[PDB]
Amino acid sequence: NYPAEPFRIKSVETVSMIPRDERLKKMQEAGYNTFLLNSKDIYIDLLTDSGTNAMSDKQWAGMMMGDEAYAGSENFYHLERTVQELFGFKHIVPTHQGRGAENLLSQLAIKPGQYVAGNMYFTTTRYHQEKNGAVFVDIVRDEAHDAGLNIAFKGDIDLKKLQKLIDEKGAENIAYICLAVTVNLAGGQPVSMANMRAVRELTAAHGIKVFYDATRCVENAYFIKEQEQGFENKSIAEIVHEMFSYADGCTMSGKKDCLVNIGGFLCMNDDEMFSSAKELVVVYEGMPSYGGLAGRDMEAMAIGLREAMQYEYIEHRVKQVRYLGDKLKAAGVPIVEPVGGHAVFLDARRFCEHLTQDEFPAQSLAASIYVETGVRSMERGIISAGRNNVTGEHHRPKLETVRLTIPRRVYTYAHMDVVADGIIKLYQHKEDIRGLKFIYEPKQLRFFTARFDYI
Amino acid sequence: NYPAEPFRIKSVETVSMIPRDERLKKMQEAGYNTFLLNSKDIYIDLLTDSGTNAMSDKQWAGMMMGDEAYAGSENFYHLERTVQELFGFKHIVPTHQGRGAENLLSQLAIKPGQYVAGNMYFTTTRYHQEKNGAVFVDIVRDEAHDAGLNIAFKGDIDLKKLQKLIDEKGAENIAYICLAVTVNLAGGQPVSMANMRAVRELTAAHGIKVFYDATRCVENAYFIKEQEQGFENKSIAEIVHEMFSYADGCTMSGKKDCLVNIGGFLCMNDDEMFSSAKELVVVYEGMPSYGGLAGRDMEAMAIGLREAMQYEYIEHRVKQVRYLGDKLKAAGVPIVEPVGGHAVFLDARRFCEHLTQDEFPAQSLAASIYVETGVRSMERGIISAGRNNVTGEHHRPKLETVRLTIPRRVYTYAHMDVVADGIIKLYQHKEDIRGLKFIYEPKQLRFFTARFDYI
Amino acid sequence: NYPAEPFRIKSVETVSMIPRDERLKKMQEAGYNTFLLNSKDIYIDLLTDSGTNAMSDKQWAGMMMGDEAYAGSENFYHLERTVQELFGFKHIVPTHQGRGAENLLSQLAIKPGQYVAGNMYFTTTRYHQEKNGAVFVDIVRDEAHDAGLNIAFKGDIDLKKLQKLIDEKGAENIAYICLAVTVNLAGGQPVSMANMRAVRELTAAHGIKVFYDATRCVENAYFIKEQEQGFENKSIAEIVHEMFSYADGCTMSGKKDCLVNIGGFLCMNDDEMFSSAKELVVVYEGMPSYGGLAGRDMEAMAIGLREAMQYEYIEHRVKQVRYLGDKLKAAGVPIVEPVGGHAVFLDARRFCEHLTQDEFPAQSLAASIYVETGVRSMERGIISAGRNNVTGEHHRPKLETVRLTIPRRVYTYAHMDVVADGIIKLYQHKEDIRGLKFIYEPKQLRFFTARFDYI
Amino acid sequence: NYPAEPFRIKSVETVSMIPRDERLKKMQEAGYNTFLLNSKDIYIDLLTDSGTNAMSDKQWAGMMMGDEAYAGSENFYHLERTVQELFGFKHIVPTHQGRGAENLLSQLAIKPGQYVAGNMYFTTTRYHQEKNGAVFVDIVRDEAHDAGLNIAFKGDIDLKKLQKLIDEKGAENIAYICLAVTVNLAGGQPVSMANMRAVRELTAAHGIKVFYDATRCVENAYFIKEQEQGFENKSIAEIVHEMFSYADGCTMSGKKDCLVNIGGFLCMNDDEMFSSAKELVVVYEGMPSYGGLAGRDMEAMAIGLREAMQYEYIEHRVKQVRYLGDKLKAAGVPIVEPVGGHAVFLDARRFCEHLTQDEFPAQSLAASIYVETGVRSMERGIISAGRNNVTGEHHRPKLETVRLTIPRRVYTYAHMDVVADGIIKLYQHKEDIRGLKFIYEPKQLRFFTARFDYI
Numbered sequence A, B, C, D: 001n002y003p004a005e006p007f008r009i010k011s012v013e014t015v016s017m018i019p020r021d022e023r024l025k026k027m028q029e030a031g032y033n034t035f036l037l038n039s040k041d042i043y044i045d046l047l048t049d050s051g052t053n054a055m056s057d058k059q060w061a062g063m064m065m066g067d068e069a070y071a072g073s074e075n076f077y078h079l080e081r082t083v084q085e086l087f088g089f090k091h092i093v094p095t096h097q098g099r100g101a102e103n104l105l106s107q108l109a110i111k112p113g114q115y116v117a118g119n120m121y122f123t124t125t126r127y128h129q130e131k132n133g134a135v136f137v138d139i140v141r142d143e144a145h146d147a148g149l150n151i152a153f154k155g156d157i158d159l160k161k162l163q164k165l166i167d168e169k170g171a172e173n174i175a176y177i178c179l180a181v182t183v184n185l186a187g188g189q190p191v192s193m194a195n196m197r198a199v200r201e202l203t204a205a206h207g208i209k210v211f212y213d214a215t216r217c218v219e220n221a222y223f224i225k226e227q228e229q230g231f232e233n234k235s236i237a238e239i240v241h242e243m244f245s246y247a248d249g250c251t252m253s254g255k256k257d258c259l260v261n262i263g264g265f266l267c268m269n270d271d272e273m274f275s276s277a278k279e280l281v282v283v284y285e286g287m288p289s290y291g292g293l294a295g296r297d298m299e300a301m302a303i304g305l306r307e308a309m310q311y312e313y314i315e316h317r318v319k320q321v322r323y324l325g326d327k328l329k330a331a332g333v334p335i336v337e338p339v340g341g342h343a344v345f346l347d348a349r350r351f352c353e354h355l356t357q358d359e360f361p362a363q364s365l366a367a368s369i370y371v372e373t374g375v376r377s378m379e380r381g382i383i384s385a386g387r388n389n390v391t392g393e394h395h396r397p398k399l400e401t402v403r404l405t406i407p408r409r410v411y412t413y414a415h416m417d418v419v420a421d422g423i424i425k426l427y428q429h430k431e432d433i434r435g436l437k438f439i440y441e442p443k444q445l446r447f448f449t450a451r452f453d454y455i
């Protein structure tokens, strides 16, 4: 079953329906790198679900009532009481987006030499942990690394790996547990309430802190309601509130599940850490009452978080992504499984099994997708993995994928059909997809500006 | 066969459905007239495509640039030059919506006792004609009155009927010909360019004026591009401009094909009529430099009329309607054919064959659609047709229909599926729809606020 | 005393500060007729206070929550309950602006041959009365016609003239009393609560209806609070509510005191007349639940009317106009007295006593004002009075004035200084102002498009 | 002498004042730190000109055209080309505000143990310099530290002090020169073009880099046009472009002179520094294609920077501030002279001569201003100056001031009169202002959330 949009269109965004031949010229001018494409040349932009969401009429009304005061903004107080109500944390500090909050948390909670353990990782989160002296330990369940394994709650932490780490390193040497919901690197996989309670109860017995990377906690809450026995009678808001009752705080990118284009925040329960966070936020972000956000954006984020609690909205969000995955899977197109909350990942290694990884099959598949459909997707393979600057060799990730990342409330099922039909047509002649070679490679951030040509 | 939306969603508004028990209460509280239901008590609102459209990001930018000056507003100049360029008329008078322009035209162009002849009547148009002393004559071809007859360009004027009117009454006794594009009450049926050219040639030879009801002229232009031989390679803009070259002026409800929520205008080429129009607009609408519109709405309407010229937009607009008709027809649901530009018309005579037209099956069907679905639709039969102003009896149209009217850029195909699925289920117990009778009848345009009760 | 703005600036409107020499060229291209000037060439536009107001951040938020449904809009219900609460009338019908409501009232309440009596008149109001068969009778107090007489509540009806009319014409032959607040033609003069009660008590004894032209009722309420003994302890909202308790209904131009750019409405208490008004509004305006307004504008007008009840806002509004009048009066510049609620009127006859009225001193003074300052003002003299089309002679009004009309919340005291300093400088060399002659005169609405040159 | 606002008010927000009894409660609840008061409890908020500006209608139109794409946004391209054109730098990295750019610059350009020399310190700038291992050296001329000394271009660097630093430390030990325009903590004092040219010539000869704090560069350009010989006929844009020709890059808080509520950027000419900047911005701000800003805010800031170039706008901006200073000085109120571009600084040492700087007279004066007036102002003395990071003692600046900071395009001269009149009355019982002492002191940037109590 795939539900209809639980909203109607209030206003539309103009696009340039350029045809295939012109799309080819734009792709060549971008050096076959979708990251170099101009937004104005893209019909359906699936590069990321971060900050690309459509706001409601209620959020736009709030955008007209920005109290832009430097301190004491009414919009901040609205955001504060909303996050306190919905997440249950005692103290909240806004940040301009998620990695601003991660910067704060990692400076507050890590002493050099300590360990941070998590259910896999995200690039910015792990960078700020390591930059502040932590050693990262992956404690995710082993199944999360099987990209073809179709099982529920793949994001769960292995309690046995967590126990092993405590025994071998010592509780006092573990800064915190970093539990992400959902788990982006596994394809957007959810974590169960049962895992969140087990982790809280093991860490509490040792005095270890747990902080959530809550960026897609609402998709996570939908999976819990859909699939975890005993949550059929719970509202999304009830599930979210219980999720965060097992954490000491969180970092949040409002740009994802708060249904906004900018914004985030840091939560915690400890008064002392909150006092230190306020001393630090002014260094990087702004006042504790705006944190690098305009008043109107705190207001949009406060309204959006509350909108995200509506069951019909989050059900349709997740099931629209699932519609895309299901349609591709039905035509035999290889994808990471299960489909996550926010994106479908094509297995470009299997899609283009006639190409070696050094020929960048995901980069090339993403270029072909745009040419055939006007859809932009993200390369998440060897190119994004970067080059080892010491040895000069590629970082070679096991996962060679193209990410079809779905912004919230922006596209329809007909847009999902544009995407799927185009990919399926490409799959039926997949042997024709050509490999790519560098013609320009920057020394760093190569996924952002590298240019290619066909082999 | 059905294109995806040629735009993205920029902002949304939530939708909801109240339980059938409450919809039943609401329907009897509205006296079984859909016009009297409240907006909030409705899930998908297909009452009308008038003023319910979603504007674009460019239009909303123009909404922030309202120049609210009483005379000489930049927004007025923008609207004036846009209409001059796209329609080709010499003069434009803005009005707050279409019936304000009809009011002006009927007072300017009708001597009491003269005939106005058009391709089927429309409620407000015919009232302003008759209020100013004209007798309406319907010169559409007979086929346009048969719901099930699937023929192209049903809106065309019968040239033999027009020739006969000129012969029997004399050209000097005919105020003007009123040529509507599309023809709303025939089902949204288009008029061919060949017919517009033949009407121009025959009227000009007798010195008779031709004024267009331009309200859905862009939907009309799409049908010409799609189906009229020789127009397949002409742009929508080119077709629209040529359409109006066969007219002496027009009335326009911007609320339809100008993609706005309010606004309209009157166009003419004649200098003396324009001078008289400026005197009269001050009485009813406002100064000729704003015509009862805020500056920001003249801006939105100028921007919207130009957006409407985008082929991909209007193709999708029309085919979204066609998708709804195609799904209903594939399931055996009787509809007006061919499907028009703006709405699907259920054939209430066949849906409610157990009822006579004096039991108002169209009014009754629209109530029952709401009760069982929460979708709002409009009566378009005997109740709308009003009473003969000589005998006091019902006007009895062959078309007794219930209109599912699609606002532009608001709903998705998934919303069309919801509508279709709910009508298809209701179709399987159509015998349960009761007949209605008046308990309150307005003395003119009675459909708007009439109240009924079951027989 | 002149209070500071009781608001701050949320957003600004861009203007083109063109210098004096360029202003002269724009004035010549406009044929020395300020009505022909382009808004983009005007620094301070004092043509009218109608629909030129600045909205608040709260109103703009409401502009993002337009429920654009054709019937049953939430915005209409908000407007309805606001007007019912603040004005106290039982029934309300929105109209696109004031003269739309006047059209409705005059068709509902006048039988041909009847009289309508008022405290002077306004052009559109009196047109709709006379168009529907009424004979207008001025029953204002005689002092209102002395433009130099500085006395309070100049707008009051002479109860003796009203009694004389009842005695001579008969109560059954009087359609209604039309009481305007404020009285525009007298320079924006207020009416006292005591006069409103006396008029209600005389008309009620004879069964005569009283309808208010309430367009500037909030300025009127401020004068009552400032100057009528016994109202020092009453809020503006209390005074407004009591004002309308002495009427059977009203016509309202929201474009004035409801702090919006478009909108109005018709109020009444009588159920039967309300039923007839609903049957009529659909002819000219729209549904009883939108009346020719977008949903967002009903919402803006509902919010704006409520904002207009704040004492500090309306005190500053009136005292800012008074600042302009006081400054001019202090330099000896001749003005109509007392200064009204919305505008200062220069006495161009005395200002340019070296010019005859046939040389259009007000038209010329308004052109000089724009050239010297970038301020646009309205000619309210012989030009606007029009020409007698039967005899070809000018209508020669006793009042030859230039109206400095002040939009609400748009300008500062520094802008008022620009206006005053420029006029005072012109007054010090007033003998240099040249007379004007027609070089183009349209047959009607000549103030709107006539062009002049210097004698 | 004082020009009127070169714009109209497009929309407003209400202001209010709570009784003195409640302001007294609020002030002690904020621990006598103005930074801790709530926005709603304030009547005229002069805490800061940062991010509190009123945007224009054109900026709000751009706000509706946010292109929220993660890369390749039209808004990014618009900002990039606008800054390239107006400032002349080769490369731009957006940041969410100015201290995000300062964070990047200090990490990119400072080797630990090197010197950074600037024309007086600023709080966030100096913290990021010292956090990355630099020693700050103040090379502004001595006069800039004397509050009452009325001399032009107080912001100028002392070339002798710069020459001495190069001689004693060596050019290789100097990370860069930090030249701020205007100089905030000297009172908003400007820098001459002659000084910018002389600093460029002396630094280039030693291979030393020069980076500008561009935050109030347009106010600075106005002072150059007004007072520096030879610049009287150059446009603001021309002066700004020439100013930055003497720099290797800049940090910019758009929140000041770009007329926006959020936003900033980092500019540089060097390719290798730009490459390193793109790596670092991803860690702290976001991808180089949005830098932690929504697309709509990059658009607002591009539009705002260009509006800031309008002479009449910036002349009025600066002279509005000067009007406030002129009125205070005419009444004997001790202020910093000359009045700067963005704020009037009351001389707290002379206002509170009965207090020593260890009793924090500036902090105390700002509290008492709020209590007696409801106007909010900011401490700009010993509390802001922080502590010496070697001895642990207060930095002791000669300038102990209370800042009345004027947001751009928000307030009127009448609001300035209210401020001035309230300060003038407080001046006549200045002996009542008590001294303060810390009860809570943050370990860095302590002024933001410090809490005090009376001694």
Ligand SMILES: C=C(/N=C/c1c(COP(=O)(O)O)cnc(C)c1O)C(=O)O
Pocket: B047, B048, B049, B050, B097, B098, B099, B100, B122, B124, B125, B180, B184, B213, B215, B252, B253, B254, B255, B264
């Ligand atoms: C309101 C509708 N029609 C309006 C209309 C009008 C009147 O326009 P306004 O609603 O803008 O007055 C004129 N001509 C045609 C063909 C129309 O369809 C409707 O069909 O729901």
Ligand SMILES: C=C(/N=C/c1c(COP(=O)(O)O)cnc(C)c1O)C(=O)O
Pocket: D047, D048, D049, D050, D097, D098, D099, D100, D122, D124, D125, D180, D184, D213, D215, D252, D253, D254, D255, D264
């Ligand atoms: C917030 C203020 N200043 C910010 C500022 C900054 C820091 O900018 P952000 O506040 O945008 O981080 C940098 N440089 C100068 C000269 C500044 O004045 C203020 O003066 O209130």
Ligand SMILES: *N[C@@H](Cc1ccc(O)c(F)c1)C(=O)O
Pocket: A047, A048, A049, A050, A123, A124, A184, D282
């Ligand atoms: N978390 C978001 C945004 C993001 C973060 C870091 C990068 O390096 C990106 F390319 C994008 C996401 O999943 O896209």
Ligand SMILES: *N[C@@H](Cc1ccc(O)c(F)c1)C(=O)O
Pocket: B282, C047, C048, C049, C050, C123, C124, C184
């Ligand atoms: N009532 C308003 C608007 C108005 C009405 C009729 C005219 O003829 C005008 F010129 C203006 C006002 O006082 O301007």
Ligand SMILES: [K+]
Pocket: A050, A051, A052, A261, A262, D068, D069, D293, D294, D295
């Ligand atoms: K974004």
Ligand SMILES: [K+]
Pocket: B050, B051, B052, B261, B262, C068, C069, C070, C293, C294, C295
């Ligand atoms: K509407």
Ligand SMILES: [K+]
Pocket: B068, B069, B293, B294, B295, C050, C051, C052, C261, C262
């Ligand atoms: K207007």
Ligand SMILES: [K+]
Pocket: A068, A069, A070, A293, A294, A295, D050, D051, D052, D261, D262
């Ligand atoms: K702000």
